[PDB]
Amino acid sequence: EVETFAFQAEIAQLMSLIINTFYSNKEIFLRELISNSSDALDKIRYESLTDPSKLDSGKELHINLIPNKQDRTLTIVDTGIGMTKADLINNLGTIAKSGTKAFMEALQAGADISMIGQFGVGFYSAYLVAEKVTVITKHNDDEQYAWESSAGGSFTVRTDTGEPMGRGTKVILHLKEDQTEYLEERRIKEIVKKHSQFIGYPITLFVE
């Protein structure tokens, strides 16, 4: 059972802009995804202060970076609060309609694509380097779901019965053929040190 949805016009326009605009500084996609993981981890940390049972689905708060050269994928895994099915469908928990508007207005006032995260739509910077993105998530209040999109105006949502996660979100980037540098250990280390050196959770870079 696969459900197919149309992106709202503003989000489809944002995705087309990220895919078709000439912009060389693509590495910022990783900072944006680590930042989103950190926000998810802050949220489960805060909720767990008053209700420690929210950590029954996993006490470890961390971020893993998993490159796979054979599949040409870079996966970012976190054990944050996760997302419900309703949040996935509602632009992955983002204010994507108003955020896209504010980002578009900023771009005309002197901003560049690297400032995308300031408008709450940093997730979509994944399309600077990925031809397809799969988001697997598990929130304490819902079942495990997989969201997927190759852009083109639509996304799918399905239940995910393979590999239960416990709690959190997994973003799988199916890299564009000319963006395989982001699977190289030295390149990932460089980007984490440059843009994410002070994140408040352990970031483990897996090796092959």
Ligand X SMILES: CCCc1cc(-n2c(=O)[nH]c3ccccc32)c(O)cc1O
Annotated binding site for ATP: 36, 78, 97, 123
Residues 58-87 that bind ligand X (CB under 6 A): 78, 80-83
Instruction: Using only the alpha carbons of the chain, give its radius of gyration.
Output: 16
Q: What is the largest CA-CA distance in the chain?
A: 47
The minimum distance between CB 168 and ligand X, in angstroms, equals 6
Rounded to the nearest 10 degrees, what angle do helices 96-107 and 9-20 cross at?
A: 50
Which of these segments, 12-20, 30-38, 109-117, 182-190, binds ligand X (CB under 6 A)? 30-38
Residues 93-132 that bind ligand X (CB under 6 A): 93, 123
User: How many residues in the shown chain lie near ligand X by CB under 6 A?
Assistant: 18
Residue 184 CA, chain-centre distance (Å), reads 19
Residues 143-162 that bind ligand X (CB under 6 A): none
Residue nearest to ligand X (CB): 40
Give me 198's structure tokens.
């002070």
Q: Rule CB under 6 A: say whether 91 interacts with ligand X.
A: no
What span, in angstroms and rounded, lies between the C-alpha atoms of 34 and 63? 8
The minimum distance between CB 78 and ligand X, in angstroms, equals 5
Residue 132, SS3? Answer: strand
